[PDB]
From Swiss-Prot:
It comes from Homo sapiens. This is Growth arrest-specific protein 7. Residues 1-60 form the SH3 domain. It is found in: Cytoplasm. It is linked to A chromosomal aberration involving GAS7 is found in acute myeloid leukemia. Translocation t(11;17)(q23;p13) with KMT2A/MLL1. The gene is GAS7. The lineage of its organism: Eukaryota, Metazoa, Chordata, Craniata, Vertebrata. May play a role in promoting maturation and morphological differentiation of cerebellar neurons.
């Protein structure tokens, strides 16, 4: 465990402009940043990256 993993509940959206990073529901995503009470960048096997709040993910 190099970085902390988290399971997405239900990834909701609204501002879809450019290559916005879409997670799947129930998906196992590791964070790429660790600010205490901040935004975390999710990694995907898809190969893209983007920062989202803890609201859409659940720390494992």
């Amino acid at each position: 465990m190099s970085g902390a993993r988290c399971r997405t509940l239900y990834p909701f959206s609204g501002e879809r402009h450019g290559q916005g990073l879409r997670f799947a529901a129930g998906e196992l995503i590791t964070l790429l940043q660790v600010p205490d009470g901040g935004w975390w960048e999710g990694e995907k096997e898809d190969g893209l990256r983007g920062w989202f709040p803890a609201s859409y993910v659940q720390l494992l």
